[PDB]
Amino acid sequence: SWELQRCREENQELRDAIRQSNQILREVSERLLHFQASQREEKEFLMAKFQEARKLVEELGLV
Amino acid sequence: SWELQRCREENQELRDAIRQSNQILREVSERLLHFQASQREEKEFLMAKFQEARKLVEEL
Amino acid sequence: SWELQRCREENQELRDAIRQSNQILREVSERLLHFQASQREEKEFLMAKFQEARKLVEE
Amino acid sequence: GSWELQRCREENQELRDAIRQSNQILREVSERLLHFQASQREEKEFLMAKFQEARKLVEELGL
Numbered sequence: 001s002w003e004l005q006r007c008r009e010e011n012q013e014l015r016d017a018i019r020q021s022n023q024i025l026r027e028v029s030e031r032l033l034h035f036q037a038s039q040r041e042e043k044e045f046l047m048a049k050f051q052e053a054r055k056l057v058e059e060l061g062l063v
Numbered sequence: 064s065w066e067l068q069r070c071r072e073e074n075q076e077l078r079d080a081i082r083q084s085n086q087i088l089r090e091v092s093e094r095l096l097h098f099q100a101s102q103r104e105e106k107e108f109l110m111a112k113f114q115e116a117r118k119l120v121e122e123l
Numbered sequence: 124s125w126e127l128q129r130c131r132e133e134n135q136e137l138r139d140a141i142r143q144s145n146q147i148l149r150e151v152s153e154r155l156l157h158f159q160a161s162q163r164e165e166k167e168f169l170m171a172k173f174q175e176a177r178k179l180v181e182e
Numbered sequence: 183g184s185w186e187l188q189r190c191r192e193e194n195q196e197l198r199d200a201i202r203q204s205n206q207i208l209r210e211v212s213e214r215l216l217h218f219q220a221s222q223r224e225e226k227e228f229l230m231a232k233f234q235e236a237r238k239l240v241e242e243l244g245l
């Protein structure tokens with residue numbers, strides 16, 4: 001049937017779009033884990049500095 | 064004889080799933096854009112802390 | 124003595140400078156904890172909404 | 183001279199050094215936040231790019 005052939009093609013494209021869109025979302029989730037690993041290193045540089053500052057004032061007797 | 068009707072029903076279920084997914088992703092996107100704007104504004108207070116520190120290093 | 128009084132007064136000013144700079148750093152740290160909380164909430168929302176999208180696709 | 187004046191002078195030197203250290207800490211924290219900001223910017227640009235990919239997949243169905 002003309003209409004059945006057309007409908008079958010459209011359904012396969014719809015399935016492909018859903019599958020490809022899920023893969024995009026999966027890649028987003030994985031990459032966000034990488035951004036978070038790098039941002040954990042940033043927090044570590046920052047935390048080291050804030051601890052150095054705290055020690056400075058404790059030691060000067062200013063706490 | 065019901066092959067086309069089956070295919071049309073599948074098409075409708077798939078179109079509805081795509082629409083719902085699009086709605087979800089539109090919500091995420093729009094919320095993240097508004098969030099970036101709010102965060103930019105909130106970061107202005109950090110910028111202000113460092114301007115105060117600069118002024119201090121100068122007045123010393 | 125005169126010299127002791129001058130040194131004590133200078134030390135008060137220096138301590139005040141240190142208090143100010145330390146308080147600025149404490150405010151930065153506190154505000155960064157605000158940012159961390161906000162970002163965690165947005166990450167949780169995104170995760171939840173991606174899961175909802177992954178569910179509509181099941182079946 | 184007195185023992186108490188020598189302490190005061192030693193305290194004065196340690197506070198001067200502490201001010202220089204505090205300034206260094208402030209500077210390093212500022213630099214790190216600029217780097218963290220650049221990281222977050224890249225994360226935002228990545229998310230925008232992936233959402234655009236998904237939208238274009240759906241637009242290309244033509245429905």
Ligand code: PRO
Nearest residue numbers: 104106107108109111
């Ligand atoms: O950027 C400004 O002008 C001010 C400073 C912190 C809040 N907004």
Ligand code: PRO
Nearest residue numbers: 126129130133191194
């Ligand atoms: O002017 C003062 O008295 C302090 C003492 C140590 C050096 N400067």
Ligand SMILES: [Er+3]
Nearest residue numbers: 189192193196
């Ligand atoms: Er000592």
Ligand SMILES: [Tb+3]
Nearest residue numbers: 103104105107
């Ligand atoms: Tb503003």
Ligand SMILES: [Tb+3]
Nearest residue numbers: 188189192193
């Ligand atoms: Tb000593």
Ligand SMILES: [Tb+3]
Nearest residue numbers: 209210213214
């Ligand atoms: Tb540096």
Ligand SMILES: [Y+3]
Nearest residue numbers: 163164167168
């Ligand atoms: Y929560």
Ligand SMILES: [Y+3]
Nearest residue numbers: 223224227228
């Ligand atoms: Y970039």
